[PDB]
């Protein structure tokens, strides 16, 4: 309180006689009427050469250059001068002008003295009496003011350089009126420390302490300059402290001022000044008094007048930060400050300290930010001509550097705290609180900038980061809040039934294992918060657009917190599985959406494959399973409907039945769900796809199987359409499966899923082939019956150039008659199938039917097994009747017609398949044999019967031959020398005289003109008869040795009886074509061993029963061992 009361008396004294209505000095040019020293610089005013200015009113005398340094009040100076010259009437007249000025002041502005009175809580009476007392204290002039002054010159900082060295030798002169003293000199230092105390007696508060800093030039140039100018010691700067601005024990940095235009000046001087004023002992410094005034006035204005509200003054321009109050309150502090030397920056740092307590109050952070940007700009920028850091210039603050640093730190912390609950503390529902939030951050920036610029701090906590942390802290607390209040918030903000808006349990305004609804609701609240941050707070907090986006930070933190929680929750749900598959899928869609809407695009998570699908995968897999069962049970339903409906084709162009459509619909529904998940993890997708491909495979094979199992039962004659439809179903599976394979990404599908479906497609292709075969097979008995009827008709056609006109009916008409049984079948069925079968189904059916027809015709018509019996075999002495040229024709034409039928003008099988058909080629081959020439048949026999030259089985002896093929050295024909050496092991211990001889026969083409047979002599009673007899066949010239074979026959010579065949051996002359000559022991057989073509050629040749070559060939091949004396039938 003791300071409060004194500050009140001083403030009344200040404002009763304010500086703003001090009288100006009326300076006449004056020639000094006595040897005079300038009241400001103490230079000799004398004569015309050292004229000064004399103020008429105050009789202060100064140089012209000094008249403006005289801030001394003209009226007080006048009262003093008048006193020091003994002019008492003038003194009293000035005391009367001083009284009238104080009466004017009270009359004009009583509200000042009233506001002082209220700010200091003084009574109107004690105010009026103190007012009378301070009026007298001003009218004491300075005749009744005196002081002792103790001036410790502490230091200067940042002085100018004036020496040849680029430094200075600073010393200080302190002058107080009549007395001049000097510090010792500090050499070479721009930041000198003196710490030197002078004592002075001051009889006049309008004296001025002239503290002049000088460079001590003792040199010749100084001794020269001394003649012309009174300040030889090259002037470094001054401070001119008005003695009215002294109070108690002061400790003050004074910036140094320019005395003259040639003065370069920089830096400050710290002066510790104790002043012992008469009637004002032990008073506080005017800085401390001003602080006390400003604090009381602030607490009065804010708390007492405005109930706590900080009334921001209407103030504009670069001096707005110097306006703290309304006019009256402003004039109080300004007149106090101006009268008592309190610099504007001190006033500001003080008011900033006041505002720092009320920083929560509306608009204050803007004012404070502005004020601090000015305080910043002051210390940071002012005068680059200084050689001192902003931090050191700020260490010369009379507010105290430390104090302001601490003040800013406390404030910065208070701002950090409030920003750590920014949503609550600055609700979006108040734009003004959003603007205070904005200005709270702008103040935090201004503080950080002040730390960076004024304090020159190397690493201040970066404002953007500090705020980002605050935002994180708030977001955490927000997250907690919503995470504790979820149902209330959601109920209120979104729920369309009011009965659901209320207080659902804390465990459901928080997580539940029984239901996901908390999470759904939490997501919508997270969205609401992220949107509020995006929409309200991000525009609000745009100060660091490249470093702070509140919507991004909100999304990141909220998703992070949510994601950790959700991940634990999904893990927990994965254990319990109390909610349904569908619910987790819906949650998955929501989380997917949330993520993809707000999170996917944040750099932090565009940088990743999203992890949330891994939470849901177990649930999607469970769903895929459930879906498989549902699919397989649906399938049996779908099939049972279709089966009961007898498999109607869906329509006359949808050649498949309905169950296909049902099933693929079910599959497609199932697939589309998965596909809509769009799971961003390709391995989880591969897993889903593998899982699902199995589903597909299982279902579709089970379809194919159910069909395949019943298929044969439908292949009966009344339901021909149903097999076609089932084949079309099957094929429609293949088609829809290719669609589905492609819909599953085709080439972009996972390798095992793709493999599975390619497998499935090949299996299904094969099912269709089997079904096509099973179908074609139900026609086989009819095709056989038909082809037997075609055979019954063709038997009536023979070699008809010598037969009646119903069978010498044209080759065409006989072909048509022959075909009629099968064309009744074919035309109807192939035209029906061509309609009701899909084109893939039709082609497969047709191949299976074509083969079946060709083979049936080959077997039943061209090579009927009874033609073994009727001229291959022994059964009937008939000529069999060959396929006659006319019946070879007719058949070849029936076949071209069948081929045209199966071609169906391109609707059936390609002409190319039909022509290349091995079935047709085989049929043509057998046919070609029936007309072929005797020699060509015989050549064919030798070339085909290759196995008649690789070991007789069950031999009846053997023959040693030596054989020399001569590509006859005399002709280039071939001749065959055959030395019959011996026989051995003849199984012929006979019922008589055995008389073996060896017939040798050559066989092959073109032998009609040639000796086909030789024989050895006979040998009596000899199972090992030697012969040593050499024969010489001629071959043709044309046919090579490979067209020929020797046939070696042992016979028992039997006059009266018949010469019994003992045995037979074949030697292929192809071998001899390499060997040139061969010794060989031919094993003897009972009959020659044959293939189908030997036996076919033989039954053909036997029909040529007038051709002598054929007769002898047939006879020769049809020779077998007359069984007896050693056995009947051989092995091949």
UniProtKB/Swiss-Prot annotation:
Residues that bind Ca(2+) 1: 163, 169, 215, 217
Every C2 domain range: 130-254, 955-1082
Residues annotated as domain MHD2: 816-941
Signal sequence interval, chain numbering: none
Domain (MHD1) ranges: 564-707
Subcellular location: Cytoplasm; Cell membrane; Presynaptic cell membrane; Presynaptic active zone
Zinc finger intervals, Phorbol-ester/DAG-type: 24-74
A GO MF term: diacylglycerol binding
Keywords, comma-separated and alphabetical: Calcium, Cell membrane, Cell projection, Coiled coil, Cytoplasm, Differentiation, Exocytosis, Membrane, Metal-binding, Phosphoprotein, Repeat, Synapse, Zinc, Zinc-finger
Keyword Repeat attached: yes
Cellular compartments per GO CC: axon; calyx of Held; cytoplasm; glutamatergic synapse; neuromuscular junction; neuron projection; presynapse; presynaptic active zone
Residues where Zn(2+) 2 binds: 55, 58, 74
Membrane topology: Peripheral membrane protein
Inactivation phenotype: Mice display normal synapse formation but abnormal synaptic vesicle maturation and die shortly after birth. Heterozygotes exhibit impaired insulin secretion and abnormal glucose tolerance.
Cell division keyword on record: no
Quaternary structure and interacting proteins, as annotated: Interacts with the N-termini of STX1A and/or STX1B1 and DOC2A. Interacts with BSN. Interacts with RIMS1 which recruits UNC13A to the active zone. Forms homodimers via its first C2 domain. Also interacts via this domain with the zinc finger domain of RIMS2. Part of a complex consisting of ERC2, RIMS1 and UNC13A. Also part of a complex consisting of UNC13A, RIMS2 and RAB3A. Interacts with FBXO45 (via SRY domain); leading to the degradation of UNC13A by the proteasome.
Function field: Plays a role in vesicle maturation during exocytosis as a target of the diacylglycerol second messenger pathway. Involved in neurotransmitter release by acting in synaptic vesicle priming prior to vesicle fusion and participates in the activity-dependent refilling of readily releasable vesicle pool (RRP). Essential for synaptic vesicle maturation in most excitatory/glutamatergic but not inhibitory/GABA-mediated synapses. Facilitates neuronal dense core vesicles fusion as well as controls the location and efficiency of their synaptic release.
Record protein name field: Protein unc-13 homolog A
Source organism of the structure: Mus musculus
Residues of the full protein shown: 539 to 1712 of 1712
């Amino acid at each position: 309180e003791e300071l409060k009361n004194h500050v009140y008396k001083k403030t009344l004294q200040a404002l009763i006689y304010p500086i703003s209505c001090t009288t100006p000095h009326n300076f006449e040019v004056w020639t000094a009427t006595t040897p005079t020293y300038c009241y400001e610089c103490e230079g000799l005013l004398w004569g015309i050469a050292r004229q000064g200015m004399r103020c008429t009113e105050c009789g202060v005398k100064c140089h012209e250059k000094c008249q403006d340094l005289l801030n001394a009040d003209c009226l007080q100076r006048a009262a003093e001068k008048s006193s020091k010259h003994g002019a008492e009437d003038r003194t009293q007249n000035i005391i009367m002008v001083l009284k009238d000025r104080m009466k004017i002041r009270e009359r004009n502005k009583p509200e000042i003295f009233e506001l002082i009175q209220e700010v200091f809580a003084v009574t109107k009476s004690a105010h009026t009496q103190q007012m009378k007392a301070v009026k007298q204290s001003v009218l004491d002039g300075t005749s009744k003011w005196s002081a002792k002054i103790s001036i410790t010159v502490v230091c200067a900082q940042g002085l100018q350089a004036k020496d040849k060295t680029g430094s200075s030798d600073p010393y200080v002169t302190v002058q107080v009126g009549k007395t001049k003293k000097r510090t010792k000199t500090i050499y070479g230092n721009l930041n000198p420390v003196w710490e030197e105390n002078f004592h002075f007696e001051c009889h006049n508060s309008s004296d001025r302490i002239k503290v002049r800093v000088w460079d001590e030039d003792d040199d010749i140039k100084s001794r020269v300059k001394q003649r012309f100018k009174r300040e030889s010691d090259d002037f470094l700067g001054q401070t001119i402290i008005e003695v009215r601005t002294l109070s108690g024990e002061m400790d003050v940095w004074y910036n140094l001022d320019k005395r003259t235009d040639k003065s370069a000046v920089s830096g400050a001087i710290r002066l510790h000044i104790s002043v012992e004023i008469k009637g004002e002992e032990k008073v506080a410094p005017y800085h401390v008094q001003y602080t006390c005034l400003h604090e009381n006035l602030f607490h009065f204005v804010t708390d007492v007048q405005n109930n706590g509200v900080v009334k921001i003054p209407d103030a504009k321009g670069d001096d707005a930060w110097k306006v703290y109050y309304d006019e009256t309150a402003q004039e109080i502090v300004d007149e106090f400050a101006m009268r008592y030397g309190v610099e504007s920056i001190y006033q500001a740092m003080t008011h900033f300290a006041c505002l720092s307590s009320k920083y929560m109050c509306p608009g204050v952070p803007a004012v404070m930010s502005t004020l601090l940007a000015n305080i910043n700009a002051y210390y940071a920028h002012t005068t680059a001509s200084t050689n001192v850091s902003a931090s050191d210039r700020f260490a010369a603050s009379n507010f105290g550097k430390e104090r302001f640093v601490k003040l800013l730190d406390q404030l910065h912390n208070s701002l950090r705290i409030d920003l750590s609950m920014y949503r609550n503390n600055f609700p979006a529902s108040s734009p003004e609180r959003l603007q205070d939030l904005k200005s709270t951050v702008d103040l935090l920036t201004s503080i950080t900038f002040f730390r960076m610029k004024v304090q020159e701090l190397q690493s201040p906590p970066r404002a953007s980061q500090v705020v980002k942390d605050c935002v994180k802290a708030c977001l955490n607390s927000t997250y907690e809040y919503i995470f504790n209040n979820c149902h209330e918030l959601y109920g209120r903000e979104y729920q369309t039934d009011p009965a659901k808006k209320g207080e659902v349990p804390p465990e459901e305004q928080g997580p539940s294992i029984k239901n996901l609804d908390f999470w759904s609701k939490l997501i919508t609240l997270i969205v609401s918060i992220i949107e509020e941050d995006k929409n309200s707070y991000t525009p609000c907090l745009n100060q660091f657009p490249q470093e702070l986006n509140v919507g991004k930070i909100s999304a990141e933190v909220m998703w992070s917190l949510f994601a950790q929680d959700m991940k634990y929750a999904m893990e927990e749900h994965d254990k319990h599985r109390l909610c349904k598959s569908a619910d987790y899928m819906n949650l998955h869609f929501k989380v997917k959406w949330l993520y993809n809407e707000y999170v996917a695009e944040l750099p932090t998570f565009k940088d990743r494959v999203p992890e949330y699908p891994a939470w849901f995968e177990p649930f999607v897999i469970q769903w895929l399973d459930e879906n498989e069962e549902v699919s397989r049970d649906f399938l049996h339903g779908a099939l049972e409907r279709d089966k009961k409906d007898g498999f109607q084709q869906t329509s006359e162009h949808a050649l498949f039945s309905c169950s296909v459509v049902d099933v693929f619909s079910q599959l497609n529904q199932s697939f589309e769900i998965i596909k809509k998940l769009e799971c961003p993890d390709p391995q989880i997708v591969g897993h889903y796809m593998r899982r699902f491909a199995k589903t597909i495979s299982n279902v579709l094979l089970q379809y194919a199987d159910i069909v395949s199992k019943d298929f044969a039962s439908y292949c009966s004659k009344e339901k021909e359409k149903v097999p076609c439809i089932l084949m079309n179903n099957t094929q429609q599976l293949r088609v829809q499966l290719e669609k589905m394979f492609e819909a599953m990404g085709g080439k972009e599908l996972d390798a095992e899923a793709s493999g599975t479906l390619k497998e499935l497609q090949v299996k299904l292709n094969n099912v269709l082939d089997e079904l096509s075969h099973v179908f074609a097979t139900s026609f086989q008995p009819h095709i056989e019956e038909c082809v037997r009827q075609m055979g019954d008709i063709l038997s009536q056609v023979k070699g008809t150039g010598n037969v009646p006109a119903s069978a010498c009916s044209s080759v065409a008409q006989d072909a048509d008659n022959v075909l009629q049984p099968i064309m009744d079948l074919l035309d109807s069925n192939l035209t029906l199938f061509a309609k009701i079968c899909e084109k893939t189904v039709l082609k497969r059916v047709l191949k299976e039917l074509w083969k079946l027809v060709m083979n049936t015709m080959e077997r039943t018509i061209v090579l009927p097994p009874e033609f073994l019996s009727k001229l291959k075999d022994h059964m009937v002495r008939e000529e069999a009747k060959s396929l006659t040229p006319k019946q070879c024709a007719v058949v070849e034409l029936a076949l071209d017609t069948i081929k045209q039928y199966f071609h169906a003008g391109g609707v059936g099988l390609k002409k190319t398949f039909l022509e290349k058909s091995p079935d047709l080629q085989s049929l043509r081959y057998a046919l070609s044999l029936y007309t072929q020439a005797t020699d060509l048949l015989i050549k064919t026999f030798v070339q085909t019967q290759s196995a008649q030259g690789s070991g007789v089985e069950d031999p009846v002896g053997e023959v040693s031959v030596h054989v020399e093929l001569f590509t006859h050295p005399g002709t280039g024909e071939q001749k065959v020398t055959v030395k019959v050496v011996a026989a051995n092991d003849l199984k012929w211990q006979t019922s008589g005289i055995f008389r073996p001889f060896i017939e040798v026969n050559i066989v092959g083409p073109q032998l009609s003109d040639k000796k086909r047979k030789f024989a050895t002599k006979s040998k009596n009673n000899s199972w090992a008869p030697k012969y040593n007899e050499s024969f010489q066949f001629s071959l043709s010239a044309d046919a090579g040795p490979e067209c020929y074979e020797l046939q070696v026959c042992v016979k028992d010579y039997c006059f009266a009886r018949e010469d019994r065949t003992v045995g037979l051996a074949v030697l292929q002359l192809r071998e001899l074509a390499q060997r040139g000559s061969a010794a060989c022991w031919l094993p003897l057989g009972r009959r020659i061993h044959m293939d189908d073509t030997g036996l076919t050629v033989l039954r053909i040749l036997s029909q040529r029963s007038n051709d002598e070559v054929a007769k002898e060939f047939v006879k020769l091949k049809s020779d077998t061992r007359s069984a007896e004396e050693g056995g009947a039938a051989p092995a091949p």
